[PDB]
Amino acid sequence: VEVLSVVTGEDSITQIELYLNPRMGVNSPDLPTSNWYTYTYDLQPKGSSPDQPIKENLPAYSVARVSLPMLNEDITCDTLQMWEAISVKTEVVGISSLINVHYWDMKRVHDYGAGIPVSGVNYHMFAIGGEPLDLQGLVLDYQTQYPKTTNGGPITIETVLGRKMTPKNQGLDPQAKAKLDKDGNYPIEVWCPDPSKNENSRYYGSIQTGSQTPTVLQFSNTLTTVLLDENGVGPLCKGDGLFISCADIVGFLFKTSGKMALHGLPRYFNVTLRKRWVK
Amino acid sequence: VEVLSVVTGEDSITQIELYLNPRMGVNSPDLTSNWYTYTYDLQPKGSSPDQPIKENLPAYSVARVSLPMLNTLQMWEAISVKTEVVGISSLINVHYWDMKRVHDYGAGIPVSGVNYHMFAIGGEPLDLQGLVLDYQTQYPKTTGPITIETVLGRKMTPKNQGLDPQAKAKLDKDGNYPIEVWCPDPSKNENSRYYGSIQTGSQTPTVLQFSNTLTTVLLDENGVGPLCKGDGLFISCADIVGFLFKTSGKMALHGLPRYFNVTLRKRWVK
Amino acid sequence: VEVLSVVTGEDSITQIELYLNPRMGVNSPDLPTTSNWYTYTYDLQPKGSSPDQPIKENLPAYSVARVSLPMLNTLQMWEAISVKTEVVGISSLINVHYWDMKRVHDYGAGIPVSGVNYHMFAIGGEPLDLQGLVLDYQTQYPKTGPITIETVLGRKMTPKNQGLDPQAKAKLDKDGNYPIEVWCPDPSKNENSRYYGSIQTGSQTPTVLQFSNTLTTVLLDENGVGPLCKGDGLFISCADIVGFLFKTSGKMALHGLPRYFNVTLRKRWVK
Amino acid sequence: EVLSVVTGEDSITQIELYLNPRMGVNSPDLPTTSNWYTYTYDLQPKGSSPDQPIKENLPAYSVARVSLPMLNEDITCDTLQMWEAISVKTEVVGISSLINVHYWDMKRVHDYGAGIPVSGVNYHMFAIGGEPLDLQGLVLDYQTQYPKTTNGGPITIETVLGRKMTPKNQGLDPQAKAKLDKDGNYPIEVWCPDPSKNENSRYYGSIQTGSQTPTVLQFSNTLTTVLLDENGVGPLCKGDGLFISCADIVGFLFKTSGKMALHGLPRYFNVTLRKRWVK
Amino acid sequence: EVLSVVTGEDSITQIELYLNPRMGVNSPDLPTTSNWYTYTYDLQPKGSSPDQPIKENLPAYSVARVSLPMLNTLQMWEAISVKTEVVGISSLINVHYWDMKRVHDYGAGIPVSGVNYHMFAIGGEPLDLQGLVLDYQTQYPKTGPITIETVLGRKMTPKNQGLDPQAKAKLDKDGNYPIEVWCPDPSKNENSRYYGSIQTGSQTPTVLQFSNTLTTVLLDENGVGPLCKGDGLFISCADIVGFLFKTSGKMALHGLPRYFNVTLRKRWVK
Ligand SMILES: CC(=O)N[C@@H]1[C@@H](O)[C@H](O[C@@H]2O[C@H](CO)[C@H](O)[C@H](O[C@]3(C(=O)O)C[C@H](O)[C@@H](NC(C)=O)[C@H]([C@H](O)[C@H](O)CO)O3)[C@H]2O)[C@@H](CO)O[C@H]1O
Ligand SMILES: CC(=O)N[C@H]1[C@H]([C@H](O)[C@H](O)CO)O[C@@](O)(C(=O)O)C[C@@H]1O
Ligand SMILES: [Cl-]
Ligand SMILES: [Cl-]
Ligand SMILES: [Cl-]
Ligand SMILES: [Cl-]
Ligand SMILES: [Cl-]
């Protein structure tokens, strides 16, 4: 997979724009329950063993594969052009919507007060790759009984192993590995990016725990992420496909009853790519 | 529009100064004006639906600045800006007559909690994307703030809790675009620069800086700043600085004004 | 004033040292009657009925000094090029055993000085330009005592003074006289001054401060010019509120610390 | 004496590994107790003197020695080639797992609410060296009776001194030194890196105390730590051994009863080494 | 006058030391009270005036003078850089001190947290100190701690709540100068470098870093480090890391030792 020179010429640079809507558990706006689109259901400890969480309570990674302009007339040549992602402008959309402290069923911060704003657990990541993101499985509790389904979601450790989790899945088990190849099917609480692979991807992420911790976010269209590695090489899109992945949990909606649901926001991407000779 | 060379000469540079007063809900000091720079009391009803009043919807400030007329032609290019939140010091006041106390015999709870800060400099209106916390929120009809129902010509659906590419607007009117409804559209705004932050929480400290030594460069990666179409410079902002906590337990958001000093140069364009 | 070249010669550079003591409300230590509360306010409380009629002891104000510089005289002016500045006495805030300190819980230590912080300093060749803006326009500040928006306008504040009112302007020409809660630096003026500040609200928010004698602030603008001292006077201004003293009864007073300055100045030709 | 970097073909090599946390329950393989793998047991003040902590409540450092390819045919020569560690990409794995706020026995934040997220005390460090990490002993309370090493306990200050601790071990006792040469046997609360030694190691660490303090962690495969010193020399691997140490405490699991247990996450390393001539 | 840096074979030396914290119980070698070494006694507002704090409740600065090899227009050692580290940070993960107050019933102990104070100084003479106290009516013990009364020879007046030019001392004795009374004097200390911070609050997270890759450069703006008068290097510090919370509700401040490795070079001076 030898990288040669950057292609020179007129249309050697292109731009790819897209947005990814969050997949928090209620993943569709088009259902007769869709009122909770971009939210989970109510998150509660069961109180007895074992936990059997519902799919609505399992926020999942967003992913899209973007098809790119075909570059090579004869694909049997050793030396071909490939799209190389060199930079990205990315932004969490709808941040301002979180100033709303008057949702009708918001728990009031104290008697007669404004609602507790969306706050608490945050998880924020994005990835740009020339192939699916590689995932490592690890869970808080190996005894958790994740939903078994027939329609390909959610995919968890039991799904990939073809057998029950054992205690080692609370740590790093090299067999618990997957590719982020489907939108809204790989739960955040089960899968993280695999740092031992992903040579052809760049990812950036953070978590914030706490129950009412401030959600603190910036947005600016002046911010650019360079996607080049130390050798000056960005992700190379094999099969003329650009993989874009993300997750943006922005906190809890505090309901009057005391119930709490996690909330997510969409993410925008503008990826600059260039043509690169490879061998 | 292809960008040519920067113009050289004696009157090549100019500086535009302005301030923008906050539009929190009570938007005029010349009327109920006692609550100017504040909302009314923000309070989840406990029952459905939510029908917020106009006084409870903080909105973006905006001004179009007419620039000296110039005229393949010359356009004004915004190259840098000094901007500052004005009146930050007023927030040390912990003795508002009706301020809720931190405890018995204590000082008032200081303005703190939800902050939202943004400013934009552009050569056309700021492009907005609509997204709401709850699509069932019934905003007042435009007679009146502009919201998603106004632009769509029909009610919101669940998709307006996410990114609906139809929910788009332009920031063309001062005090009319609710902050909780509209955010800068990153898919557009090629000819504007915007910078913003949010801080959620109820008594989360308000932490702000001020200095006249701080400059924001508005040039893009190619060395080109926003280009002022029809000789109009668009200046937009929002500066929510937290809640005024009242004795009863009621709470209102508060805003502060923003000052701008924009440096512009003449630029040949085709 | 057109700025020419930096003067060359043996004694073209001078250094100015000073400290400013905080003006928190009880502004003097020399009153045998009430100076125990020097560097603090009195007890800050919401009145519970309208209007607020705050006392002078509850209005922290800016510190100011004009420093006389050597007479030089198209003429020469002193140009401030850098400053080393420090909040003095930061270590005193480890004391959690003030005799009347509200305890964190039963048998525990005192609540340390914490909560509202406001820190700013300014160096200029003339008084700092101030913009007026208050939380509540119906506040009835003491008559001139402190100089407030009502003082400069010669009439009662109106709602517009809760936002930016271009008539609500003053110069910081008097020590301990301009209430911090009324006045902020005017960013529309102050071309011949450099100012830096911040605020932190919240009731018990940690007071977090640094101090080092290795930190210099460069005062030159984007054109390599520092403030130029009109009539050979250097103006230094600051405020350093460091949080609340929490008292047993529930009462709370604001506290401030002093600030030190070492300003480096050079001679500059101007026209 | 350090001489010149070796110029040649296979002059650079990469070493990949992960270390699973040793929080107290250190094996996933034990017949009965292993469900608490990556956790401590319940942490409690005894209420009477002295503290007599159990193994399971004493998080320890992770460590591995990695065998490097043999470089010298003749080991008698004055001048030899050694592996020199020059950079490392390291990442805490499984960070996303901490969004789980529905552990079956999770203490709620309030009635009907979600579980208190894993939060509070954090401790994070990693070290890359050419020899075992040098340790310095210091404890909160010198009267603490750690389980005896001979009884199958961890190695602590008493172990190294051959006698009981005295009040001076609440400060810096220059005789309370050890080397990190054993996985999950040196307690974090007893041993910190020794700054008076470790010339042939690079270490980086932080603590965060408080009970429900947000756990704030980042992850990216774009972040590289440079291991070179001020003279441009990285750790030199004695006996062809690369020493890799870490500790990643990420907070408390809050249980319904009020009981609390600390939790850790695994850490991944990718160390780049080059060949170096040494006299 | 500072001349040229000495060139030659043995011109650079390294000085290594550590300093144990002087929180109040200053010695590990006492009959029955050393169990609290590196801590204060219990800190408690009396509820009546005046405060009469005990020496066990007054954390003080650590200081050492290191003798450097003799050299003698003369040569002097010049401190050019330091690696410094707070040792024992990992010990603070212990949430099971036998008498630790719980966060809630059945819970773990409240971790060491709250007030932090961190400072270090390297110089060629003793650090210059400025006196300032929260409460000038505080009755400190006589000499033993050295406080403002000791140095003035008369009672503190209200001015000592601010900056009193007469309230000055030199940090010449280990564990004798209370932190709550003395801070580094910025009006002197030309021949020292000092770096410090405070963090207030009762349960504020203790957030500390440690790494053997961090170096502080000690040279001033002219490239000159502290010059060691009479071949003596002065090293001073303080590291309060927060409170130990006891079951009863009582609280003690706690400190940690600090390590130093100073690089010095020979410098010609007239
Ligand atoms: C059956 C009965 O009533 N017995 C009591 C016995 O409990 C008591 O001992 C004291 O009990 C209290 C209970 O809150 C504390 O546990 C005392 O311990 C501490 C404290 O936390 O207050 C421990 C702390 O470390 C000590 N501080 C220092 C600096 O050493 C303090 C301190 O010495 C005391 O508060 C005195 O200032 O004590 C514990 O001593 C005894 C003795 O009072 O009386 C029996 O009748
Ligand atoms: C500014 C000041 O001196 N405040 C003091 C007040 C007032 O003397 C009286 O309340 C009269 O208003 O009295 C206290 O006992 C109190 O209530 O806590 C102590 C406090 O320091
Ligand atoms: Cl995050
Ligand atoms: Cl913000
Ligand atoms: Cl501040
Ligand atoms: Cl940490
Ligand atoms: Cl600190």
UniProtKB/TrEMBL annotation, chain B:
Localization of this protein: Host nucleus; Virion
Annotated protein name in UniProt: VP1
Main location: host cell
Highest taxon listed in the record's lineage: Viruses
Keywords for this protein: Capsid protein, Disulfide bond, Host nucleus, Host-virus interaction, Late protein, Phosphoprotein, T=7 icosahedral capsid protein, Viral attachment to host cell, Viral penetration into host cytoplasm, Virion, Virus endocytosis by host, Virus entry into host cell
Subunit structure: Homomultimer; disulfide-linked. The virus capsid is composed of 72 icosahedral units, each one composed of five disulfide-linked copies of VP1. Interacts with minor capsid proteins VP2 and VP3.
GO CC, one annotated term: host cell nucleus
Organism per entry: Merkel cell polyomavirus
Portion of the parent chain present: 39 to 318 of 422
GO MF entry, a single one: structural molecule activity
Disulfide bond in keyword set: yes
GO term, biological process aspect, one: virion attachment to host cell
Membership in a protein family: Belongs to the polyomaviruses coat protein VP1 family.
Claim: RNA-binding is one of the keywords in the record: no
Automatic annotation (TrEMBL), chain E:
Quaternary structure, from the entry: Homomultimer; disulfide-linked. The virus capsid is composed of 72 icosahedral units, each one composed of five disulfide-linked copies of VP1. Interacts with minor capsid proteins VP2 and VP3.
GO cellular component, one term: host cell nucleus
Family the entry assigns: Belongs to the polyomaviruses coat protein VP1 family.
Protein's organism: Merkel cell polyomavirus
Gene designation: VP1
One of the GO biological process terms: endocytosis involved in viral entry into host cell
The protein's name: VP1
Lineage: Viruses, Monodnaviria, Shotokuvirae, Cossaviricota, Papovaviricetes
Principal place of residence: host cell
GO molecular function (one): structural molecule activity
